[PDB]
């Protein structure tokens with residue numbers, strides 16, 4: 001009766017005592033919305049397993065006999081052989097199907113949960129917010145009585161057919177979605193989001209075309225893309241709960257998720273959020289929808305009658321009987337709800353404890369809900385090793401013995417990579433080494449700067465989870481406003497020249513080798529004091545502010561920083577070889593155009609004859625210029641043909657590619673299951689089956 | 699200069715290189731296709747495990 005009770009659904013007196021709280025959290029509620037959400041979640045996970053979890057690509061990620069540097073959260077965990085991995089993914093698929101159909105619900109949830117977290121904890125490089133959300137939702141649905149309506153288990157058991165469920169099943173899910181929206185919103189209250197730096201280039205997508213009718217691009221990229229996301233996060237957190245604002249909230253949230261699905265390649269996350277959005281509606285909407293159909297549909301759709309009493313709810317007895325005393329499962333459910341929501345609120349801000357994982361950003365990516373907040377651009381990665389026996393110094397391929405590229409931004413992954421290299425290099429005639437890393441990275445278009453000290457042996461370095469790392473360089477926030485001026489310098493260049501901005505600590509130095517092609521390269525100092533040394537003649541010059549030097553091409557040079565503060569400078573270069581090739585190509589293009597339009601009546605040179613013929617048959621091999629010209633022309637024609645493609649063909653190719661992925665996954669799974677059960681046949685049969693599996697559908 | 703893992707000093711020293719043919723790699727997103735086949739010794743191990751292909 002009270003307005004507060006109507007708006008929030010519970011009275012204040014309900015919270016006076018623990019028993020009343022348990023009764024409130026275990027009141028009866030209709031199950032239909034939970035059943036619909038369970039069905040949709042199961043369907044989306046079933047579609048997601050063969051695409052993003054990597055079942056199609058799992059034959060080239062956990063291959064037996066290959067030497068790879070893993071990145072697990074615990075060093076004890078190691079991958080199983082390939083066949084057991086495919087068995088694990090098969091168990092995942094069966095669990096997802098069981099959840100979708102609600103057959104043996106608890107067993108299916110367990111079989112989906114344990115393998116999923118086993119795969120998730122095995123590799124830190126595949127972590128991301130929408131996988132963590134799937135894991136959490138699978139964990140929550142394991143305990144909820146979501147099989148009470150529109151489930152095969154209902155047909156096999158009368159007691160669990162169209163039955164009541166306690167309210168906390170809905171409460172936990174609503175709390176989870178609200179926490180996602182609110183934590184994402186507050187995390188985007190950062191200087192790099194409210195100012196327009198993060199996601200600066202997404203406003204050019206054609207989906208934002210109508211907004212450009214009334215706004216300029218610069219305002220369109222700030223008011224709509226950035227501020228709109230924050231406002232929608234907070235509002236969609238709040239609006240959906242109340243009845244007054246539910247329609248507008250649903251409309252905006254649906255538009256937001258559809259645009260996110262089209263712009264990005266996040267995967268099934270947008271559809272999962274769309275499936276979760278109706279959950280804030282009244283719990284009985286599928287039932288009234290089923291009621292509003294003809295009788296013929298009602299003979300096939302789920303039941304419309306009122307739900308029956310259950311045993312997993314505290315029933316208020318109005319017959320004069322004493323109220324049902326809450327047992328154990330009700331108290332356990334209430335405690336689970338409160339503790340789980342408190343833990344979910346606490347965990348995103350728990351970075352002050354696990355300081356070992358801290359970096360320029362906060363903690364490992366995945367469980368902070370900071371989506372599309374930081375963009376990074378790597379420039380160079382140098383890995384040096386010194387042999388412990390002879391003393392030779394050498395350089396390694398930066399991406400050796402690895403499958404991901406997130407180790408350039410986390411100290412712990414760097415340490416694991418160093419240990420892996422230490423164990424593996426003795427196979428390549430190298431004794432106990434000392435490894436040094438030098439990585440350059442810029443976040444949100446700042447000065448490119450070192451992230452780890454290049455003078456520290458990472459193999460013997462010190463690292464623990466709960467102490468700050470002593471060899472991670474700080475991020476210089478004092479140079480932030482320069483992002484204005486640098487952008488102006490980016491707009492003052494020609495179509496050929498290029499610029500790279502560098503900032504360096506005192507004491508350190510950068511050694512570089514300009515390639516012979518990059519002639520006409522210059523270095524200019526913006527702030528600080530630096531000294532540029534040429535080793536060809538061993539000559540070092542000290543550069544002051546606003547001075548420019550022309551560096552040699554094809555030689556080694558060094559820059560040392562000799563100021564109390566960090567020094568910022570800039571390389572400006574042009575590629576001479578590409579320019580000369582372009583001029584020659586333009587000259588050749590001009591010559592063919594003169595030949596075609598009737599000018600240049602004189603006989604063509606022999607080297608030009610292959611261009612008109614277009615085929616090398618019965619003649620000398622073409623010169624490199626002719627080959628490059630023909631390759632460019634063919635590439636341009638291929639791109640032009642690709643652009644001129646109708647929609648239906650693109651849709652058909654998309655469907656065929658997806659069907660190929662599904663078929664390959666299924667066939668590989670069957671082959672490996674046969675190998676496990678009936679043993680491994682001869683090599684020729686295995687080769688034949690593998691060849692058959694990879695065949696395109698056509 | 700012995701095998702794919704080891705590279706010359708000149709190749710390592712070059713900071714000003716051509717990354718593509720556009721970077722701006724954001725997190726979340728997607729594994730974005732499979733370069734995994736470019737690993738060292740991937741072909742030989744694959745041919746051993748699954749026979750000729």
Ligand SMILES: C/C(=C\Cc1c(C)c(O)c2ccccc2c1O)CCC[C@H](C)CCC[C@H](C)CCCC(C)C
Pocket residue numbers: 180181184224225226228229231232233255256259260264266269270273371372
């Ligand atoms: C890419 C964006 C945010 C990152 C993100 C993603 C990818 C998610 O999957 C989220 C899911 C749940 C919660 C937060 C998520 C999240 O943060 C901004 C995208 C902004 C969009 C393109 C702008 C258009 C819609 C706006 C809100 C219209 C407002 C109109 C004004 C006049 C009020």
Ligand SMILES: *[C@@H]1O[C@H](CO)[C@@H](O[C@@H]2O[C@H](CO)[C@@H](O)[C@H](O)[C@H]2NC(C)=O)[C@H](O)[C@H]1NC(C)=O
Pocket residue numbers: 497520521522572573574
């Ligand atoms: C060498 O590169 C420089 C940039 O490092 C270029 O210099 C430009 O030269 C033209 C000459 O008309 C000026 O208008 C531009 O302002 C100059 N650019 C600057 C200062 O950034 C030029 O492309 C190359 N110069 C030579 C002589 O080869």
Ligand SMILES: *[C@@H]1O[C@H](CO)[C@@H](O[C@@H]2O[C@H](CO)[C@@H](O)[C@H](O)[C@H]2NC(C)=O)[C@H](O)[C@H]1NC(C)=O
Pocket residue numbers: 507509531533538539540560562
């Ligand atoms: C040119 O000047 C630089 C400026 O530092 C010199 O760098 C120093 O070199 C000496 C050995 O010559 C080292 O002991 C110092 O540690 C270097 N300084 C720093 C800050 O690292 C460089 O050597 C000079 N080159 C020549 C040929 O004289």
Ligand SMILES: *[C@@H]1O[C@H](CO)[C@@H](O)[C@H](O)[C@H]1NC(C)=O
Pocket residue numbers: 427428429
């Ligand atoms: C050095 O490595 C090569 C290449 O792996 C190997 O064939 C050889 O055994 C090693 N040589 C010596 C002298 O240890």
Ligand SMILES: *[C@@H]1O[C@H](CO)[C@@H](O)[C@H](O)[C@H]1NC(C)=O
Pocket residue numbers: 515517518575576577578581714715716
């Ligand atoms: C410069 O241009 C040439 C043109 O052939 C190209 O091969 C090369 O990759 C470019 N970059 C460097 C560093 O030489």
